[PDB]
Enzyme design. Sequence first.
Site, PDB file in Angstrom:
ATOM      1  N   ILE A  67       0.853  -1.176   0.000  1.00 10.08           N
ATOM      2  CA  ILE A  67       0.000   0.000   0.000  1.00 10.08           C
ATOM      3  C   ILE A  67       0.894   1.232   0.000  1.00 10.08           C
ATOM      4  O   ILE A  67       1.841   1.331   0.792  1.00 10.08           O
ATOM      5  CB  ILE A  67      -0.956   0.016   1.205  1.00 10.08           C
ATOM      6  CG1 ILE A  67      -1.810  -1.262   1.272  1.00 10.08           C
ATOM      7  CG2 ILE A  67      -1.823   1.276   1.129  1.00 10.08           C
ATOM      8  CD1 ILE A  67      -2.626  -1.574   0.016  1.00 10.08           C
ATOM      9  N   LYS A  68       0.606   2.164  -0.899  1.00 13.60           N
ATOM     10  CA  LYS A  68       1.425   3.358  -1.089  1.00 13.60           C
ATOM     11  C   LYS A  68       0.785   4.535  -0.358  1.00 13.60           C
ATOM     12  O   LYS A  68      -0.418   4.781  -0.483  1.00 13.60           O
ATOM     13  CB  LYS A  68       1.598   3.625  -2.587  1.00 13.60           C
ATOM     14  CG  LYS A  68       2.302   4.927  -2.910  1.00 13.60           C
ATOM     15  CD  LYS A  68       2.504   5.156  -4.396  1.00 13.60           C
ATOM     16  CE  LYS A  68       3.767   4.542  -4.887  1.00 13.60           C
ATOM     17  NZ  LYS A  68       4.072   5.004  -6.295  1.00 13.60           N
ATOM     18  N   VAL A  69       1.597   5.239   0.423  1.00  6.33           N
ATOM     19  CA  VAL A  69       1.162   6.264   1.367  1.00  6.33           C
ATOM     20  C   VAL A  69       2.114   7.451   1.254  1.00  6.33           C
ATOM     21  O   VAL A  69       3.336   7.279   1.393  1.00  6.33           O
ATOM     22  CB  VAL A  69       1.193   5.705   2.801  1.00  6.33           C
ATOM     23  CG1 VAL A  69       0.946   6.797   3.819  1.00  6.33           C
ATOM     24  CG2 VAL A  69       0.195   4.555   2.955  1.00  6.33           C
TER      25      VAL A  69
END
Length: 350
Positions: free
Chosen positions: A136-138
């Site tokens: 997951i990219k944050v």
Amino acid sequence: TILSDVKALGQQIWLDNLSRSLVQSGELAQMLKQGVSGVTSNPAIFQKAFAGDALYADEVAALKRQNLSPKQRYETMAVADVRAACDVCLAEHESTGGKTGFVSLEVSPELAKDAQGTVEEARRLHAAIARKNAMIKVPATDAGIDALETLVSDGISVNLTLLFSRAQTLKAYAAYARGIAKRLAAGQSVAHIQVVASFFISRVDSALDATLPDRLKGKTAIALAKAAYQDWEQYFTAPEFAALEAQGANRVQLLWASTGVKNPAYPDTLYVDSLIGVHTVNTVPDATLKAFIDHGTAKATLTESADEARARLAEIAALGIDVETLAARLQEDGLKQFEEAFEKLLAPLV
């Protein structure tokens, strides 16, 4: 296979693109056969995919007959694309014991300053994708770094993005370490948790090159990356992290992003050629991947001439350019651009 030579130098090359046709055409699988070992996406990538890819049309029509928000329609299609790419990358992931072969999906840019909302959406998307090789990219805002610690403690692999600052990157490492420490204190596994820190390249040169004297044009972003890599070498070798690594923890790895060359006066492989070093990733747009396969060079350049990089950063500071302020400004501009792309993606799904 020049990508094999890069792998031998300790760097992975990932593709900075995702779409339904990239997978269904066999193009992604054919790239992995050349040595590509992962995939990154972001809201602008998905806006372009949805706008141009014929393979979404039937599903869009079907989803428009369901009681869903536009965001839910987007997420249904994007999660399917991520799952499909993860399955193409699974053999790579397994071949290294789970250390490679990741596909990244970014949370909504609306959440970038909201740590709790980011955690909630990241957990939801992690569960929806249901693949061990999904990240997951944050965005690496202060709230994103808060969320990173929580997500790491939950065992979720994360791609922290929109880094332009060495200080902000070091803060992210400390949050990662706190999350790992929490898991170890609860007797939980850490060996499968992977985190990358996506440190942006071309945007720094694009922002500064007009103001810089000739001798420094096209130099700042690479110099900043070389210094960031040295910061990484220090942080992850210090006795604090060493004690976590001895219990099975993985280091974060730096990931060079925005490595397509925007200035036609520079070689098209400049960023890839110049940033190759051990325990890193470089995610490249397709045109840059093709250029690098065609005429790139595989040499251990990231750790070459580190003192020159420092001298350049000092000269830039002496010219009155504050790279910390620049990083905050680029991170904001990048969030705005991702917000605009996301809004543009959602409008036709209403």
